[PDB]
Amino acid sequence: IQRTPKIQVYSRHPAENGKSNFLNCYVSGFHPSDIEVDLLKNGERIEKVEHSDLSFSKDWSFYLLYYTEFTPTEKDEYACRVNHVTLSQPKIVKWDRDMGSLVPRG
């Protein structure tokens, strides 16, 4: 009777430190509609995040887009935290970004 959310995190633009961007968390395929979604910066909840109006797909499962403007820096990690009746513990999905070459040669 209940369906667990799929959680997908993405930026609107390639990550460039110091440049404003948008962070997205798309939560979908879940039922019932009650759900809690937070965007995190360095483990702390981000205030005043926007979301789309609740909608549902053909199979009647619900979906939402949460999004916020942000400016990443080198030391910042972002994630999306979702709580739903189907989840024992809140599920945290990271924003996967590439930080360039690790080992300095110059």
């Binding site: 009777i1 369906r3 997908q8 993405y10 930026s11 609107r12 633009h13 390639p14 948008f22 997205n24 798309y26 039922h31 019932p32 509609s33 009650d34 926007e50 789309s52 109006d53 609740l54 909608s55 549902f56 009647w60 499962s61 619900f62 887009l65 999004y67 996967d96 970004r97 590439d98 360039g100 070459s101 040669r105």
Partner: protein
Amino acid sequence: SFHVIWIASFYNHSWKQNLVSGWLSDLQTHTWDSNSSTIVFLWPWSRGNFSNEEWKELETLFRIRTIRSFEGIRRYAHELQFEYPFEIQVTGGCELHGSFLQLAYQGSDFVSFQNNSWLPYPVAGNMAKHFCKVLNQNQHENDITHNLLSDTCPRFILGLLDAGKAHLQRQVKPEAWLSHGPSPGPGHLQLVCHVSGFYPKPVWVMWMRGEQEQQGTQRGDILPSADGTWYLRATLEVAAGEAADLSCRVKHSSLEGQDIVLYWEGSLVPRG
């Protein structure tokens, strides 16, 4: 194509939530304000071409139907074996030049409106049949429902698609970028090609070795952005040795044949 969706959440007898929105193609065009009982026009062309008075009639019609729908469900919930909490979802609409109206209970097909009456989905059981008895009690109301689907809805698109096709026919070029994905297993890499900001939705993206499409390319879901454009990740799993000369190629209608081509190169490799 235009349709309206209702999400009615019945948490207990005393607590409900009602969310309503309208959609032209896959674009959201209308919302309902539960307070003040007002239709909200997300775009200037959302009003189509109907007059302010006609929208007031439509608002009043939906307002009255909403009040007696929630009251009717609460009146008949126990007979229908509806156990709080439960959610009812409705979607109805049409296609210009395809009428439909379907209702779900607890996220599964329950009843639908066909021609002139509500029909139960056979698998939804005896309670769906009892529900259709309540819904079909007044044939005149069903005639109005039929006319909303077959007359009002196609007429609404006339004045909606044309008035807004400057929006639905926009071409917005994608941008793309490359990153490392989570490593699939020992000695392998995941190459990620991100494609963002394109509109309309149809898009082509492959990892390539020269002209040879790499059939390991795994295309993700197309995901929305708040600005109406779309996003997609296409990932390729490769052995660490064999990542040379790989490129991601993007084809999209907005590009007029000038594909985006990015190369797994530079610090990605990493070079020396």
